[PDB]
Design a protein around this nucleic acid. Structure first.
Length: 79
DNA sequence: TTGCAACTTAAGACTCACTAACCCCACCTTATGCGAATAGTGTTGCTCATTTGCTCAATGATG
Protein backbone atom coordinates (compact mmCIF):
# COMPACT_ATOMS: atom_id res chain seq x y z
CA UNK A 1 0.00 0.00 0.00
CA UNK A 2 2.74 2.45 0.95
CA UNK A 3 4.60 1.49 -2.21
CA UNK A 4 1.55 2.22 -4.34
CA UNK A 5 1.08 5.57 -2.64
CA UNK A 6 4.71 6.43 -3.37
CA UNK A 7 4.00 5.72 -7.02
CA UNK A 8 0.87 7.87 -7.04
CA UNK A 9 2.55 10.81 -5.32
CA UNK A 10 5.36 10.49 -7.84
CA UNK A 11 2.97 10.69 -10.80
CA UNK A 12 1.15 13.72 -9.36
CA UNK A 13 4.54 15.37 -8.89
CA UNK A 14 5.06 14.78 -12.57
CA UNK A 15 1.78 16.26 -13.77
CA UNK A 16 1.66 19.61 -11.92
CA UNK A 17 2.80 21.42 -15.10
CA UNK A 18 -0.23 19.97 -16.86
CA UNK A 19 -2.56 21.28 -14.22
CA UNK A 20 -1.29 24.84 -14.22
CA UNK A 21 -1.22 24.78 -18.02
CA UNK A 22 -4.90 23.97 -18.19
CA UNK A 23 -5.47 26.24 -15.21
CA UNK A 24 -4.62 29.30 -17.31
CA UNK A 25 -7.92 29.12 -19.15
CA UNK A 26 -10.76 29.82 -16.77
CA UNK A 27 -9.12 32.44 -14.58
CA UNK A 28 -11.35 35.46 -14.24
CA UNK A 29 -14.63 33.83 -13.38
CA UNK A 30 -14.83 35.46 -9.99
CA UNK A 31 -12.38 33.25 -8.11
CA UNK A 32 -8.68 33.33 -7.21
CA UNK A 33 -5.91 31.53 -8.98
CA UNK A 34 -4.58 29.15 -6.38
CA UNK A 35 -8.09 27.93 -5.69
CA UNK A 36 -8.07 26.77 -9.27
CA UNK A 37 -4.70 25.10 -8.98
CA UNK A 38 -5.73 23.26 -5.84
CA UNK A 39 -9.05 22.12 -7.29
CA UNK A 40 -7.22 20.89 -10.34
CA UNK A 41 -4.80 19.06 -8.08
CA UNK A 42 -7.78 17.25 -6.60
CA UNK A 43 -9.01 16.46 -10.09
CA UNK A 44 -5.73 14.96 -11.17
CA UNK A 45 -5.62 12.94 -7.97
CA UNK A 46 -8.95 11.43 -8.97
CA UNK A 47 -7.64 10.94 -12.49
CA UNK A 48 -4.70 9.03 -11.05
CA UNK A 49 -7.25 6.99 -9.15
CA UNK A 50 -9.08 6.15 -12.34
CA UNK A 51 -6.36 5.67 -14.94
CA UNK A 52 -5.22 2.36 -16.42
CA UNK A 53 -2.03 1.97 -18.43
CA UNK A 54 -2.91 -1.17 -20.34
CA UNK A 55 -5.45 0.97 -22.17
CA UNK A 56 -2.55 2.36 -24.20
CA UNK A 57 -3.09 6.13 -24.21
CA UNK A 58 -1.22 9.15 -23.01
CA UNK A 59 -2.27 10.06 -19.49
CA UNK A 60 -2.96 13.73 -20.12
CA UNK A 61 -5.90 13.30 -22.45
CA UNK A 62 -7.73 11.18 -19.92
CA UNK A 63 -6.68 13.56 -17.16
CA UNK A 64 -8.07 16.67 -18.87
CA UNK A 65 -11.66 15.63 -18.27
CA UNK A 66 -11.21 15.25 -14.54
CA UNK A 67 -9.48 18.60 -14.37
CA UNK A 68 -12.28 20.44 -16.16
CA UNK A 69 -14.67 18.53 -13.93
CA UNK A 70 -12.98 19.90 -10.85
CA UNK A 71 -12.67 23.44 -12.17
CA UNK A 72 -16.07 23.94 -13.72
CA UNK A 73 -17.65 22.09 -10.83
CA UNK A 74 -15.94 24.38 -8.35
CA UNK A 75 -16.64 27.70 -10.04
CA UNK A 76 -20.09 26.45 -10.89
CA UNK A 77 -21.27 25.95 -7.36
CA UNK A 78 -19.06 28.70 -6.04
CA UNK A 79 -20.70 31.45 -8.05
C1' DT B 1 48.09 44.10 17.66
C1' DT B 2 43.93 42.71 17.59
C1' DG B 3 39.32 41.96 19.17
C1' DC B 4 35.48 44.48 20.85
C1' DA B 5 32.29 47.70 22.66
C1' DA B 6 30.85 51.77 21.15
C1' DC B 7 29.62 55.37 18.30
C1' DT B 8 27.82 56.93 13.63
C1' DT B 9 25.47 56.63 9.47
C1' DA B 10 22.30 54.84 6.43
C1' DA B 11 18.32 52.10 4.79
C1' DG B 12 13.94 50.82 5.32
C1' DA B 13 9.08 50.14 7.14
C1' DC B 14 4.92 52.63 9.04
C1' DT B 15 1.54 56.68 9.91
C1' DC B 16 -0.51 60.63 8.52
C1' DA B 17 -2.60 64.33 6.58
C1' DC B 18 -9.83 70.52 7.55
C1' DT B 19 -15.07 70.65 8.17
C1' DA B 20 -19.89 70.23 6.58
C1' DA B 21 -23.21 69.96 2.38
C1' DC B 22 -25.47 68.94 -2.54
C1' DC B 23 -25.83 66.71 -7.57
C1' DC B 24 -24.86 62.79 -11.16
C1' DC B 25 -23.75 57.83 -12.79
C1' DA B 26 -21.84 52.81 -12.41
C1' DC B 27 -22.23 48.89 -9.99
C1' DC B 28 -20.83 41.55 -11.17
C1' DT B 29 -22.74 34.72 -16.17
C1' DT B 30 -22.01 28.98 -18.93
C1' DA B 31 -21.73 20.78 -20.13
C1' DT B 32 -23.99 17.48 -20.69
C1' DG B 33 -26.51 13.53 -18.60
C1' DC B 34 -28.23 10.23 -15.36
C1' DG B 35 -29.78 8.17 -11.33
C1' DA B 36 -30.28 8.67 -6.52
C1' DA B 37 -31.68 11.11 -2.79
C1' DT B 38 -34.09 14.25 -0.62
C1' DA B 39 -37.16 17.77 0.34
C1' DG B 40 -41.34 19.40 -0.40
C1' DT B 41 -45.91 19.37 -0.88
C1' DG B 42 -50.42 17.31 -1.26
C1' DT B 43 -54.44 14.74 0.88
C1' DT B 44 -56.85 13.35 4.24
C1' DG B 45 -58.88 11.78 8.64
C1' DC B 46 -58.67 13.46 12.65
C1' DT B 47 -58.11 17.37 17.31
C1' DC B 48 -58.44 21.57 20.34
C1' DA B 49 -59.28 26.00 21.77
C1' DT B 50 -62.60 29.98 21.81
C1' DT B 51 -66.67 33.28 21.30
C1' DT B 52 -71.85 33.94 21.55
C1' DG B 53 -76.51 32.85 22.46
C1' DC B 54 -78.77 31.14 25.70
C1' DT B 55 -80.77 28.65 29.89
C1' DC B 56 -81.00 27.61 34.94
C1' DA B 57 -80.80 29.40 39.66
C1' DA B 58 -81.41 32.05 43.41
C1' DT B 59 -82.48 36.53 46.36
C1' DG B 60 -83.56 40.64 47.81
C1' DA B 61 -86.40 44.36 45.76
C1' DT B 62 -90.80 45.40 44.69
C1' DG B 63 -96.05 44.84 43.96
Amino acid sequence: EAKARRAKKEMVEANLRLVISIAKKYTNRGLQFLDLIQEGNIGLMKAVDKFEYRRGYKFSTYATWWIRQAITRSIADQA
